[PDB]
């Protein structure tokens, strides 16, 4: 068929094959991050009391372990997400996602984790 | 925006391997002995399949050979040809960062991700990622 | 914070530690038996010891399986358990994110600071570095 | 063993020896205050539903008795303090943490007490 | 004294010995870029307009088989290679040649390829 | 198919069901417009020396057929297309593509007529 | 294991397994770099006759081999080392320590070499 | 071997025979001055305490004896020499290298001679 | 800068080259037979040859040992010695980082204009890159 | 998360599929006898089909009645029910025309997809668009 | 930095306390029996120990006398000596002048780090704090 | 230029190499005997020796004549021919600042990378430099 390729075409065997994570640009990454936040919200009667998206701010609130809210961090590297235990570590692009310049740690997953640890304990 | 030339004439060149074999079609054909083991892509929505087999020097990093199988449009075959030529005799890094508007330009027009005419980008990326496993590093693979 | 629940009685006398080792007590006891050359950590003052044994698919960099030994605190049993459930079917990178979160949550009532109760921070660091060494890409380890 | 300035050298017994409260600088104190808030936040059923740290404005939320925010006071008696009971106060230094001129006041103790009363009752 | 720093020092046998190809840190690349720019423009069968450089700006002209621009982007996400069809992809220097943080390695190979695909047809 | 809805997720259908598509507004519409533009362009009656889309400003040097210039109008009927053979028009959404409020037709269509006539003779 | 944290907490050993070097995140690095130079130098005034450290700039006067100077490079690829060895070398984080965008070499280790070679001859 | 221009292309045996250095591209002046500057830096063990590169501005500390500072003036005759040794001078290109407009001789010759005149006795 | 001591010192009487040949001179001399396949560089125009052979623990990516051959000048031996001492017990990346002014500092007072005083940069770069290539990763050679 | 039941207990017995199929299996069944020409959708390999049949008061487009068929998940019934309630007694436009979010909230925790467990957005789009074409207004549709 | 000398000279031969003690070794010696309390800090890992005993004129808060014991490095004896000399006749809190900072410079030239062969920092801080306790001031102690 | 001729036909027959040199056989072969002392350039590894010999009227500054030698590629002959035509009747000014582009342009659209295609640029440059030297002015030469 036609349009828009490769996720919209219908042979449905081009989606299990390796392809780059994004192709434009910083938009896709943010979308994925918000998507995770919506997913996280249910299954807590408390441990998420609302997710709020505001211009130049993201709030994930966790009052059952305490929390910090992230904001834009000036150029060099942008946006730390590394929870208190190891202190703040800024994150830069490395290959299709924001990977901290230390280890393989990626920001979206660190937020995913802290919320499902709450369901745990 | 010039002839390949692959104007689908007489019937010799569409589509290369399929035309050579002997037997045809036969609706129970399997490609053998040759196998993939690297990049495989195919969209049987329009009946185009491409399979790139690379060989890569471990020490040098130079792409010794790449072979293109194209079971698709006649125009598409040329895109593969020119790309495999270019990549050969040039390093690993040449193979790397292949878009998607190189192959498309080669056929005629630059738009990214042609619907059933460019499976060649997807093919090369797959092949080199496969090679990264065999390289024995997973750090740059992700 | 919530119950595991761990009875931590009776005749152990303290906590899980007796069940795993075997021979008990015996005051001549040794660390045994399977090993795969992965990390071992233990603090002598907190009374805890952990041994994580990973199995790793080298074709994708995916943790196939991970089984654990926990000696010490009841909370630490849960730390090992929950992280090991999560990490499997996921890459190397994911494992490191999951352990860091797991240590900070598990102790509970987050005082920010590191703890000896769960040794998991040192134990995963050792594992991933060890994996790189055996995978033969030590340049990207350092 | 080797490293670092000062009292960071661990002969495995420097944790029972007296050492100066900060070696750098005024920030140390602020980190401690935040650290205390994170510990305190768990074990509140609805007493603390929110703690967001913004850009030098810190909100403590108690919906069930009312609350106040703490923030930095512009240079001249730096760091603002607020209370509705005893009115607002301000600070100077006397240990590099804060002063006690009127009358033994530290925002670390003030917040600590008030939040942990909620965990209690 | 001798001859003559920094490239010059070699015996001129270094074109088969392993040495840095050329670092920047802000001077080398713009000159190299200019040499490359002229080279890519010429030898096509189809019309190529004259590349025009206006200071702080640079247009690379290619025939009407698609054309991209080469420009510097201010700190963080440097030197965007805005392709109209594929969008921008950002590169931060990493091994003496510009390496995309969204792809594999080496900037030069992309320019080479897309230009010679145009010279062809 | 998991992510990302609905332009990259299909159960093998929706390309035969009536549901709105495209839109970002800013990136998706231009991208679609370019795809159409280049596709229409082939087999031109006279060589086209270039089209450059530099930064949402596009010069299209075509001595063969129409010498329209497409640009982005500042807020107030956003986007500009001037067609030299039927004048200037400005377009605002009404059907999930930019639609003329001086005609009732999309800018996508303008390219169709003027370009494809060129292929003919 | 308690306070100060994350360093100076021990269960009677400082480490027993490797720990990746953290960011924390701008200042820490500048302190570390300055320290390394001074530490290497110490007990010898032959290698470097005097050091002056202003706020935001480091000078090390040596007439016995020439001079390299250290200063902070403006945002993105932060820290600048100017060395007459190979010219100025620009560094960006890639392992939680500043790694050369030439071959990949830590600046810390370059300082190691250059100071003790001076003490030697 | 092939590519780019002009130094790279030569067969490396036409070096002795007359060639043109060329600007490449016009940054050139900084590179040439840097080479001269390195000669000045060392070969005296008792003089030249510091050479500083502070990106664009350039300080050269030279001991007891008349001190001059040379740096690149922004285009308006782009070298400034500060000197209470023989007073100001200005320079313009006459054959692809800077020639004094008030001595009629290249700057590099003055520097070479003057520094090495000290190294003598 | 001071004497290392320099050329034709000491008790050789002239340098390393004469002393350890076997056969001297003889104008038909040959070097044989085991080599380790590490870097080789030589400029007979500058009258020098150097061969650094590293041995590498590929687990930690640390140089276990490094020995040298120096052909050139007696003064040059001192630079080769000092580096090999330094380099051992440090990572592969650390092993390099030699150029012009550093080579000059080792040999006395730098002119920083020097032309082919020593090959040591080319030699070490070659050796570490060669190791990584044999490891089956050529991404760090390029 | 709630249960309508979403298992649609009991004696149905597997979901709402067997409730209306009935007859089982039978491999020869067809949809019969009348039809009103309104929107129909079905996505094979999601195991669901939905058919909403509107009646429309031709004035401002108010939906007089709408009844549905739901085949698929028990959860899926809830979107068709809830949506039909809204649109009745009101114009179609102000009680419909929401894609991903309406589907997402209703199924349970939002997937952030409209595909394909609940077909309800596509089912309504088809019906109201078909209506508008017949109405003879299609310049605000397309 | 200058020669104490650290080793041997001037006829110590080790340190300065060993040359008066007696009993030697004996492996059963201890600090006995009357003591003034004050700062004391033993590092068993670094193997050095320092003991500053202040005497303080209570009325003016001035150090009447201060004696030291230095065990460990020979370089450290010189740092301890010069500081104890200096601080006499000056108000104790002001006099000590130590973060760190000064102690490091005395040792030879500062590494701009805490050496770990200097314990004088922990010793002095402890000592002045001890004085404040006895003087009955808790206000400026904390 | 589609054809310079590149091939060089007819009765050359392998380039202008053979046509120029000669002397055949003679068994005393070698370049001899007159020379005008103007520029000469030649690489034996590139197989081409080029010699442009100018004559210059000092009084008007005009290049009276300039004749060439071409060796190597037959493509180069046409470039040499056309340049010498232009240069004659044209001042010293024109005969200086020697291109570069001129050689490239003649053969094809300029590649902007010419490795040992012609040494003609060097030959004439040498020649005018020589002229300036003999008339005395090495400061307009530098």
From Swiss-Prot, chains A, D, E, F, G, H:
Changing residue 90 to A: Impairs cell growth and lowers aconitase activity. Changing residue 46 to A: Impairs resistance to iron-catalyzed oxidative stress, no effect on Fe(2+) delivery and cell growth. It comes from the Eukaryota. Changing residue 31 to A: Nearly abolishes ferroxidase activity, slows down oligomerization, impairs resistance to iron-catalyzed oxidative stress, no effect on Fe(2+) delivery and cell growth. Disulfide bonds: none annotated. This is Frataxin homolog, mitochondrial. It comes from Saccharomyces cerevisiae (strain ATCC 204508 / S288c). The lineage of its organism: Eukaryota, Fungi, Dikarya, Ascomycota, Saccharomycotina. The chain holds residues 52 to 172 of 174 of the full protein.
UniProtKB/Swiss-Prot annotation, chains B, C, I, J, K, L:
The keyword DNA-binding does not apply. The keyword Cell division does not apply. The chain holds residues 28 to 165 of 165 of the full protein. Its main location: mitochondrion. Present with 10800 molecules/cell in log phase SD medium. It is found in: Mitochondrion matrix. Its cofactor is [2Fe-2S] cluster; Zn(2+). Pathway: Cofactor biosynthesis; iron-sulfur cluster biosynthesis. Homodimer, but can exist as monomers or trimers. Oligomerization may be regulated by Zn(2+) availability. Component of the core Fe-S cluster (ISC) assembly machinery. Interacts with YFH1/frataxin with a 1 to 1 stoichiometry; the interaction is direct. Interacts with the mitochondrial co-chaperones JAC1 and SSQ1. Interacts with NFS1. Interacts with YAH1/ferredoxin; interacts with the reduced form. Binds 1 [2Fe-2S] cluster per subunit. Zn(2+) binding stabilizes the monomeric form. Scaffold protein for the de novo synthesis of iron-sulfur (Fe-S) clusters within mitochondria, which is required for maturation of both mitochondrial and cytoplasmic [2Fe-2S] and [4Fe-4S] proteins. First, a [2Fe-2S] cluster is transiently assembled on the scaffold proteins ISU1 and ISU2. In a second step, the cluster is released from ISU1/ISU2, transferred to glutaredoxin GRX5, followed by the formation of mitochondrial [2Fe-2S] proteins, the synthesis of [4Fe-4S] clusters and their target-specific insertion into the recipient apoproteins. Changing residue 118 to E: Disrupts iron-sulfur (Fe-S) cluster assembly. Keywords: 2Fe-2S, Iron, Iron-sulfur, Metal-binding, Mitochondrion, Transit peptide. GO terms for cellular component: cytoplasm; iron-sulfur cluster assembly complex; mitochondrial matrix; mitochondrion. Changing residue 110 to A: Wild-type growth. Belongs to the NifU family. Disruption phenotype: Cells deleted for both ISU1 and ISU2 have decreased activity of several respiratory enzymes that contain Fe-S clusters. As a result, cells grow poorly on carbon sources requiring respiration and also accumulate abnormally high levels of iron in their mitochondria. Knockdown of ISU1 in ISU2 knockout cells reduces cell growth, decreases cytosolic tRNA thiolation, and increases association between SSQ1 and GRX5. Residues 109-113 are annotated as: SSQ1 binding region. Changing residue 46 to A: Fails to complement an isu1 deletion mutation. One of its GO terms (biological process) is intracellular iron ion homeostasis. This is Iron sulfur cluster assembly protein 1, mitochondrial.
